[PDB]
Symmetry: T
Subunit: 142 residues, 12 copies
Amino acid sequence: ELIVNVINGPNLGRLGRREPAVYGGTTHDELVALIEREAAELGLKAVVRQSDSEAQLLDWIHQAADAAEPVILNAGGLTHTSVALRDACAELSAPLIEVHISNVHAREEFRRHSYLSPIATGVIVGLGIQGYLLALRYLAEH
Amino acid sequence: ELIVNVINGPNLGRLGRREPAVYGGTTHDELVALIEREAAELGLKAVVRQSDSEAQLLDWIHQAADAAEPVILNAGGLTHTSVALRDACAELSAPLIEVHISNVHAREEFRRHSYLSPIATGVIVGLGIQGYLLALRYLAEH
Amino acid sequence: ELIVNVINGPNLGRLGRREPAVYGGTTHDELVALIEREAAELGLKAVVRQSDSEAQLLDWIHQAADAAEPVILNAGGLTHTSVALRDACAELSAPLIEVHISNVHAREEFRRHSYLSPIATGVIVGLGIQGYLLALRYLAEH
Amino acid sequence: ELIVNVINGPNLGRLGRREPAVYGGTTHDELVALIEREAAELGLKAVVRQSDSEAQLLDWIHQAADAAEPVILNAGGLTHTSVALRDACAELSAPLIEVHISNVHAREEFRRHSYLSPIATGVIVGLGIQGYLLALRYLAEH
Amino acid sequence: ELIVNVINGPNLGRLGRREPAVYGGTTHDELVALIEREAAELGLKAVVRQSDSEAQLLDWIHQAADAAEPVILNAGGLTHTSVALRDACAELSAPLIEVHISNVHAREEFRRHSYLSPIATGVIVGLGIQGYLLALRYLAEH
Amino acid sequence: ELIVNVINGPNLGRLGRREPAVYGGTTHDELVALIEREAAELGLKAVVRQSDSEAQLLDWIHQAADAAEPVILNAGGLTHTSVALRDACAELSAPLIEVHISNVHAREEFRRHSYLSPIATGVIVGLGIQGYLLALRYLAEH
Amino acid sequence: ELIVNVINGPNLGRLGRREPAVYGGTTHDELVALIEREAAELGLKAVVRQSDSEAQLLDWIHQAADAAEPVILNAGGLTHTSVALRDACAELSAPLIEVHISNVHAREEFRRHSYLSPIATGVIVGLGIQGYLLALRYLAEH
Amino acid sequence: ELIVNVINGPNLGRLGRREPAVYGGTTHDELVALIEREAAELGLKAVVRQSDSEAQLLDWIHQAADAAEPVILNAGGLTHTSVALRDACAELSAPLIEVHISNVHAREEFRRHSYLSPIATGVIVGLGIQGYLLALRYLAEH
Amino acid sequence: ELIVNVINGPNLGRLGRREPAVYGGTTHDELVALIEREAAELGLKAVVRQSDSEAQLLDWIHQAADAAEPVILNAGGLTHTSVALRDACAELSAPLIEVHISNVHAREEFRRHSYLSPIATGVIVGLGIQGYLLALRYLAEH
Amino acid sequence: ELIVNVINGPNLGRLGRREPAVYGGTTHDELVALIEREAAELGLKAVVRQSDSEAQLLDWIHQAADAAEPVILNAGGLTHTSVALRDACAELSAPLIEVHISNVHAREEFRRHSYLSPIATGVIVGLGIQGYLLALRYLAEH
Amino acid sequence: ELIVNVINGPNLGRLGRREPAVYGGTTHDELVALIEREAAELGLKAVVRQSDSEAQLLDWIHQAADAAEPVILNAGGLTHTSVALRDACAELSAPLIEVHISNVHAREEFRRHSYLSPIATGVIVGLGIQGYLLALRYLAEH
Amino acid sequence: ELIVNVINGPNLGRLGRREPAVYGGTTHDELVALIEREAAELGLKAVVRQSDSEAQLLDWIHQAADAAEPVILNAGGLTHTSVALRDACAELSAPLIEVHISNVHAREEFRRHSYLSPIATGVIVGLGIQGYLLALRYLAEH
Ligand SMILES: COc1ccc(C[C@@H]2C(=O)[C@@H](O)[C@H](O)C[C@]2(O)C(=O)O)cc1
Ligand SMILES: COc1ccc(C[C@@H]2C(=O)[C@@H](O)[C@H](O)C[C@]2(O)C(=O)O)cc1
Ligand SMILES: COc1ccc(C[C@@H]2C(=O)[C@@H](O)[C@H](O)C[C@]2(O)C(=O)O)cc1
Ligand SMILES: COc1ccc(C[C@@H]2C(=O)[C@@H](O)[C@H](O)C[C@]2(O)C(=O)O)cc1
Ligand SMILES: COc1ccc(C[C@@H]2C(=O)[C@@H](O)[C@H](O)C[C@]2(O)C(=O)O)cc1
Ligand SMILES: COc1ccc(C[C@@H]2C(=O)[C@@H](O)[C@H](O)C[C@]2(O)C(=O)O)cc1
Ligand SMILES: COc1ccc(C[C@@H]2C(=O)[C@@H](O)[C@H](O)C[C@]2(O)C(=O)O)cc1
Ligand SMILES: COc1ccc(C[C@@H]2C(=O)[C@@H](O)[C@H](O)C[C@]2(O)C(=O)O)cc1
Ligand SMILES: COc1ccc(C[C@@H]2C(=O)[C@@H](O)[C@H](O)C[C@]2(O)C(=O)O)cc1
Ligand SMILES: COc1ccc(C[C@@H]2C(=O)[C@@H](O)[C@H](O)C[C@]2(O)C(=O)O)cc1
Ligand SMILES: COc1ccc(C[C@@H]2C(=O)[C@@H](O)[C@H](O)C[C@]2(O)C(=O)O)cc1
Ligand SMILES: COc1ccc(C[C@@H]2C(=O)[C@@H](O)[C@H](O)C[C@]2(O)C(=O)O)cc1
């Protein structure tokens, strides 16, 4: 199947806005372009969505559940806090790849826990924006 | 630079030996072949080593430290237990990508802790043997 | 008084959609019908609402607070995570019955904690969709 | 099948004896009468027993195991402490409904843990003596 | 009022039997005699009972609740484990003095917790058999 | 600069509605008026906003980040639960003053933890609605 | 000395009654016969007793203390909960061998703690009913 | 009433002495002057005292208890360690405002606990020396 | 020997000063008189001292160590916090009886821990000022 | 099948060398002789190996996995620390009996945890060198 | 620079007074003499002070801060309890060597924590009074 | 006796190799020379060994046990992880001095725990390479 859903959670629309010492440079719009391009090279179609609203994220997850489509999810802070997002993700029959740009293990202790990792197929963290592209390649070869 | 070190720790020589319901099929020799091939496609040279001996792993890490070469490390059970391996890895100036074949977050609680993740560049788990190939691609694009 | 509010939180609109091995069969629309029918047999009027949005749930709780109406609440994942929902529920002067379809004590440890149970009148879990009907009957006899 | 066992543990024979500010009013004998009456309205026969002796409770549970009869159990303080009672209850093939009169989540932290909840079909707490009658109705509709 | 109940729990009938290096010398019968004598000097009547059966202890506590009589309780190992005994003791309207012969704080960590201390009037530990006599004197002056 | 953002989170629109024994009397509209008046006396302009929606709060925080404006934040229950709100607040270059009306240390243990306090400039709790006015005065003198 | 006491606690009278997928097949009466036979082959006399009553178990332990006889004890659920049984067992001058049929380390975490193991001579778990026979052989060779 | 007691604990006499990168600049004598001036503008009299001696602090607290005078307390390290200071502060009938210059939540975990916060009226941290002046203003408006 | 040292720690000089709902009525001077009188009836001499200064308490303990005199100690808040006081008390060769007026187990969890209880002969709590007199009687009979 | 592997880990070669108050008397060579003799009486062949090297232990475990041979394992300190040894042992299809000479529950708390017990068939501790012989007898009867 | 401050905390004046089985023999005066002599051999001047008063210790630390002089500190029980002493020690610009006579890791668990170790240059424990002399030698060679 | 064993564990052969900002400058060979020289000045002979292999370290410890020779041990990462090394060290009859170059209390929390400290004579940390020389001097004076 061509279709892969890339879903970004709270604050992910802020990439590139604060000082390019940090998660700066690549904007969310640029990230979408990079993803779409890589997906086309791989023979996939990426549908990339971002929201600061948990309810909106839940709706996108429900739609992927109903369509049996794979999901690459960076849930932002909700990674660490939301059982509701886990409940929705546990419905997915297709692969779920959890992605984080930063190395969530190199910061505060509360970031080393994810409600999603135990139900995800796999997890990529700390490899920057390329982590999304690597997830796409996993899905293309599976 | 061409050279990337792939270092596999205890029990990783056992891939493919127990019932192909599990981490079965791909042998360690096959894994080496897959890695070497992908590395050549990427314009890298992969040097793949496996040992059940922590001391041997430490020596390989020291050599990568001295040569300023990147390391893709799957330390096996020592991931969860060895401060000595962390101490050696903290010396590396080039990237360190932690890889696990299985999703270490979907099993016992003790597997969700890694001495290596806080000092690694990033971490890939649960994406099977392709996780090594994805790490290689990260290193090629950086 | 006739009026009882039944409020369902995130993911509760998904009942009946995934494989009828699981929380499958009864849809949310069917649940509403069952509740309305039981409420009429008991001489009550049930107002049944579901949302994936915490803000919407909070508004429904506020309205029940202002009207001094009882609430039967299945907050879904927010049961385990939301202090805001607890704060809103602590305002209710009429009874609050917490309901869960599944036995929240027979799963992961994080599901055995509820922010709501300490401020609820009582709690029913694991009795399936009938738990809502039993809550209704409690309220009718009180 | 007609037969449902209602089993009450330590101190449950004390209902109604201390000041009717508290769990006062309804005596254990009255509780038995209420249960028997509700059971007959539902087309069941309730066999209601109470003991302060764990060994006696265990024998009643064994008998329900051997007869494949459902059990409504309020184990009193043993809810929070007895692995032996859990071991005996895990043998039951018919439903086990855990009931508590008080809201065990609104008191000391040690009362929020039950050895029985993980192996019970479901749990009703905080709905007073009506919780037993609601358990009976669950069993009648299943 | 004259009457004070002294209630001893499991293993307390073993005083004086194992090597008089330890809680040896004074037998339970001797303890009863010492208590009765001190009580008469104080103008009280002590009713001293011992059982290895929690159910029997519960019955004695119930009787003290119903008679509004003070209780001096050394619950033995049940001090550290029984919520049922606490539930029964919380019914007592007259004073409850918890007594232990040994210093329960000078041994294993699990002995430093008592289900009874938070609901007792007070607690005497480590003063040997005289702790019972001191409890009696407290009750005589109050 | 004149402009200070006062942002109130879930349930803060409920001030003054439940029995004036409690956080009763001052309504949210009154709070806004008090804040605006104090801000004008101090030579500032306060922009006061309240929402029960985390996504809306995040947008207001983003806008303050982009405008480099100070924020006085009472995040309500999200204080204790939301990593996403912390992530957004960590972007602010201007001061962040955390305010709570109640003394969050005098209630349940879960209220003594704040995701925001470690990244805030400072914190005021328990001084009632005047805490907002005191935060304003801090910002005016800095 | 010939005499060894085998003492079985709550629920041990249930062996062989529930579906022979589980601890099924060997009944408690059969277990007694196997033990007696092995004891005679070893030149010992086994006295095998079972009770669901902690008080009865305590009396049997007291008798072994007074007679200076070894004890093979499978305390069932009381293994994990009873300080009183530990107190009684600490009196034994002869060896105490703790036995469990099941591997108590391969189940819930609460089963991995025993009040008895620290005061037992040794412990055998997970070797089925043969664990009793192996304990007997230990005692015969010592 | 005019009189407010400002009490500073151990090390607070060190303000301004170590390198003005840190809590440098304002000396304790300067702090006293700032406080006195602000108090006079508010129509109060501030009595400002500092000691490194817990016993001296206790005496000042006792005097405020006896005089029914409000206290603004920065107990320094004793904030985190002293139950005796809490015991003395619990006697105060007038308001107690806890103040810290630094943000105690932005440092080591042990600094996020205060024995005083649960019994204080409120708490101000991280707003520098102005926190004292803001406490004064709270007391003037109440 | 006649001499017994009664040592009272921080805040104990405050008895009787705050509202006689609480630890009110008996002043410290009255307590001294009661103790002296009881000691004379018992054929002892009580030397009663109180200080809010840990250093002063330590000196009194040292003197009791050097003189091999028994100590009845109510260390106030230092009970829960001071290792130094424990170190000094561990030197005492004569009995050490820990006394608290209030039931330290019926309040906050931090009050249920004492650095002194493990090294004391015994402990009396919750029996009011009579606890001192009962300690005196223990020492007279030993 | 005849063949049983007895594998001893670090420090087990030290038996009998330090003062025969302790694990003294029986040397490792003597242990091997005792095991071989018992195995022959049982109709088995025991292959007994000891190493201080985790890598060597892993190789012996791998060989038992490949040959489908039972293992009696005393991993010494690695019992408490090595996930790698657990990973290797989880491959074994034949029984795994964990043995310890000492009672690991009667010492430091860290010795009461074993990475091996949850995946072993059973566990024998505290029965001295006879524990190996008893394991052999288990395997002979199964 | 010649000058080194040796500061001893509570109870350190008790060295040599209790039975020379223990920290007996060397008195505090002897310790001072040994230190002074070693310091002169090393070309230093040691200023040795001891107090049971935390306030006095704080003053000595302040003076060392102001003079930029090194400190060898054995804070006695305050090692384990005092944040105030840590706050004062964090001001020191010259080296801080923490010394304990006893091995603080070989006793109760609470002694294995030090508020001082994280801010000290280094730590010497368990080497008796020579630990002070070794600290002096460290300072002489640096 | 002349002979002292200095044993260095994993990674200690790396001293001086990574950037002389850090544990840089002194190489392991230089460390050996410094130790040998100091030992000769003290009238001792130091035998200095380093290995990355736990098995090799264990053999060196065994040899020191058999020869009754003192050991100065810096076990590197195994300090924090190895029970096997502790088991071997507990055999030593001569002194064991634990040394670390860095201050293990000033880094991650896992470094503040040592399996060796409770069985060592004493411990020196944070005093750099001179810590070894100071250990040597301790042993020379004892
Ligand atoms: C202020 O905007 C952002 C955007 C992304 C992040 C990182 C992402 C999060 O939202 C974190 O809560 C999470 O721990 C890591 C993260 O998901 C990532 O690295 O992609 C943080 C702040
Ligand atoms: C029996 O051989 C193996 C080989 C690999 C594994 C998985 C790897 C480990 O060694 C585990 O300790 C680790 O938690 C996960 C692992 O590193 C992986 O999934 O690659 C387990 C057993
Ligand atoms: C994917 O849709 C659902 C719907 C309901 C549930 C169960 C409900 C929840 O949302 C859980 O988070 C909660 O622990 C139990 C639950 O509230 C219930 O059993 O009703 C789970 C997933
Ligand atoms: C003194 O008699 C009683 C009777 C019932 C209770 C409540 C029941 C218990 O025995 C408690 O231990 C349990 O936590 C709650 C309880 O099972 C109930 O509410 O039914 C308490 C004391
Ligand atoms: C074997 O007989 C006894 C008798 C009394 C005790 C001490 C009492 C107990 O039953 C302990 O569980 C409890 O911790 C202390 C005790 O209640 C006492 O010291 O009186 C112990 C064993
Ligand atoms: C039902 O409406 C409210 C409004 C405010 C509060 C207090 C605020 C919260 O939302 C709490 O979750 C928080 O712990 C304290 C609070 O932020 C405050 O005191 O301002 C509680 C319930
Ligand atoms: C329902 O009857 C039984 C009988 C034996 C057991 C196992 C035994 C127990 O009573 C458990 O509580 C214990 O953890 C293990 C057990 O003692 C054994 O395996 O022998 C469980 C249920
Ligand atoms: C070395 O002098 C000082 C002075 C003040 C402080 C900060 C204050 C303390 O004493 C800390 O223990 C406390 O955690 C914070 C503090 O009370 C404040 O920020 O006012 C620290 C060191
Ligand atoms: C404000 O004066 C006092 C006096 C005594 C107390 C009780 C005593 C303390 O100092 C407490 O810290 C301790 O927990 C209990 C106490 O030692 C007692 O009840 O005697 C409390 C406050
Ligand atoms: C110094 O040589 C030894 C040999 C055996 C032991 C006991 C074994 C260990 O290696 C311990 O780590 C383990 O906790 C217990 C042990 O496995 C046993 O009792 O057989 C200890 C030290
Ligand atoms: C009764 O006099 C003393 C003197 C020194 C000590 C040891 C020192 C202490 O004060 C302890 O609190 C600390 O844990 C260890 C100690 O600092 C040392 O060994 O020097 C103990 C009791
Ligand atoms: C990369 O080489 C090294 C060498 C020494 C260290 C410090 C030593 C260790 O191996 C640490 O695991 C330990 O916590 C501290 C250490 O033992 C020391 O400071 O000597 C660290 C890395």
